[PDB]
Amino acid sequence: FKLVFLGEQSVGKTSLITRFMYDSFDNTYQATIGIDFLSKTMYLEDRTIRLQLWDTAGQERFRSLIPSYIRDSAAAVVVYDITNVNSFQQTTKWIDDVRTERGSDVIIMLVGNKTDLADKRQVSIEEGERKAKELNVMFIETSAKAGYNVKQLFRRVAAALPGM
């Protein structure tokens, strides 16, 4: 099951993955160079879901590679930063990009990350929910830093993956 993480640079794609994989968080920003692969098999009672995590770069110089990264994805996790309006606005085109590559053969989750920065919120949870409904995708808010909703993010995505 190919799961691609997408979104603007510095929204916390890698940190979400690190938190899910290792229950750790690093405050120091280490930009993803193109793509990094990780594997995690989620061991549910009725199925086994070998996740192939495609951690993609949000930096502009890798943008041309994004279509190739989305190719054949079973799931797309589109991440924004709740403190960054631009990052939220850009999620429509990320989700658009997934749709024109995958049509309906993809599970899409819209993630509003960094809820630990509640003081600096620029996008409300209602705005996030609204966009998800408009774009017919799932929605969740997370904090990679605190750990909040990270396990839930991955569990909900995996639950949504079609059986066949």
Ligand SMILES: Nc1nc2c(ncn2[C@@H]2O[C@H](COP(=O)(O)OP(=O)(O)NP(=O)(O)O)[C@@H](O)[C@H]2O)c(=O)[nH]1
């Ligand atoms: N407060 C807070 N900071 C976070 C959170 N998630 C990530 N960060 C911080 O935001 C910065 C970017 O995180 P990172 O995971 O590298 O983002 P990215 O989306 O992978 N960026 P890139 O596209 O360049 O790989 C880092 O300094 C990280 O510590 C979060 O939930 N809360």
Ligand SMILES: [Mg+2]
């Ligand atoms: Mg990254």
